[PDB]
């Protein structure tokens, strides 16, 4: 028994750490930990993004309808979220279609609808609102905040910024948080399609150009388990696109996708977004 | 050479002498530093507390 206290204290806390790694507790929400002042942190959320809100309106932007119902379930022993989220998602849909119709004038509106339904999807918006401290300020029933609820609160925050400071500042907000989520993503990672060849055929009918001949430009290792093909797509013996693949069908479909990126201006070499 | 050896003689004796008088002067000006009351009393602040 070695006399002293400091090594027993250090060892006591290392045992505490191995207890936390072996059996970690279920994650508690942030408002149920020390160092929380809700009002101060809503104000901080305002100043963080570099705009002003009417603070009561932003406060109602974080108050869900599930929270009021389970809260009144807890009373027996507040304005909801839905109006602001309605306004915010209506506005963000029409402004995203404004930006994406302005900077991509050749896109089909099916494509603009799938882009906008990507930039306002649950995956994108929930990825954005967990890094703007929206989730920490959401008054929700259950933790972690389920993704439909958090989508609703994010567009509620957009609605509150709209009523706060008009359509131009929210346009810059949506530009700076939702549009930057399509950086480094290809078009058909966002607008998924089946049968790009038929789509390319129909688009070439709309420009009054003939149907393209798929036409094998380069190949290698044709009789092996690792071939490479470049199928080209010619229109009146001038190619519009050419793409590679492991088989011929794969390369032909992919050349169809290259042609569709080229018709719509959504190439890898397009002029970047001007911020 | 730009000069003969007769021409160069003592053409830099002053600057050499002043340089060595500087070396000599930094050598003979070596002494313990000043000790201050403020440093010794400033050790009392290790038990400065709040009220």
């Amino acid at each position: 028994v070695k006399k002293g206290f400091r090594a027993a204290f250090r060892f006591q806390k290392e045992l505490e750490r191995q207890r936390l790694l072996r059996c970690p507790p279920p994650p508690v929400r942030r408002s149920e930990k020390p160092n929380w002042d809700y009002h101060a942190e809503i104000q901080a959320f305002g100043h963080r993004l570099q705009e002003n809100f009417s603070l009561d309106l932003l406060k109602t932007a974080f108050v869900n309808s599930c929270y009021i119902k389970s809260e009144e379930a807890k009373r027996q022993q507040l304005k909801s979220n839905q109006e602001l989220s309605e306004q915010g998602t209506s506005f963000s849909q029409t402004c995203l279609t404004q930006f994406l119709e302005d900077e991509y004038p050749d896109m089909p509106t099916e494509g603009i609808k799938n882009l906008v339904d990507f930039l306002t999807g649950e995956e994108v918006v929930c990825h954005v609102a967990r890094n703007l401290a929206v989730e920490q300020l959401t008054l929700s029933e259950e933790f972690p905040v389920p993704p439909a609820v958090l989508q609703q609160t994010f567009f509620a925050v957009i609605g509150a910024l709209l009523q706060s400071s008009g359509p131009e500042r929210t346009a810059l907000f949506i530009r700076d948080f939702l549009i930057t989520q399509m950086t480094g993503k290809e078009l058909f990672e966002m607008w998924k399609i089946i049968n790009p060849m038929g789509l390319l055929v129909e688009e070439l009918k709309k420009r009054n150009v003939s149907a393209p001949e798929s036409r094998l430009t380069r190949q290698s290792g044709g009789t092996t388990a690792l071939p490479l093909y470049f199928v080209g797509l010619y229109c009146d013996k001038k190619l519009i696109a050419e793409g590679p693949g492991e088989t011929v069908l794969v390369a032909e479909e992919e050349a169809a996708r290259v042609a569709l990126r080229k018709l719509y201006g959504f190439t890898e070499n397009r002029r970047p977004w001007n911020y | 050479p730009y000069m003969t050896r007769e021409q160069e003689r003592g053409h830099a004796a002053v600057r050499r002498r002043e340089a060595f008088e500087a070396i000599k002067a930094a050598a003979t000006s070596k002494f313990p530093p000043h000790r201050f009351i403020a440093d010794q009393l400033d050790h009392l602040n290790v038990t400065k507390k709040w009220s």
């Binding site: 070695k2 002293g4 400091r6 090594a7 250090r10 060892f11 | -």
Partner: protein, 140 residues
Amino acid sequence: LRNRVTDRYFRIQEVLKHARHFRGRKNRCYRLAVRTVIRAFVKCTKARYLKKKNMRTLWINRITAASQEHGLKYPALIGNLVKCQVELNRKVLADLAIYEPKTFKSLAALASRRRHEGFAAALGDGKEPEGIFSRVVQYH
């Protein structure tokens, strides 16, 4: 024992957090883990020199390969780009070789054009007009 050492689990564990990924008993037995951990740190600092060296030879391999695609050799490309006052370096030329092969093709065209003006200039000797790409920009 007046004062014997209490805090010795932590000295051992300062060494052994660096050895947890070795093999054999080097990962657990301090006496073995110390020799291997020291020896790992010495390699870790002498490897900074070799990181720089091996990147540079990697770039010379990639510039060599990409310039052999256009018929040039590596000394011809680097020499006759210096002589055009294009002071791009090996990292950038290797990255242009992979990612921007038209810029790399035009750099190989600029270097072979300069190389031929070097030939024609150093063949017809005497007072003559200099080459067009052979001219230098004087800085004062």
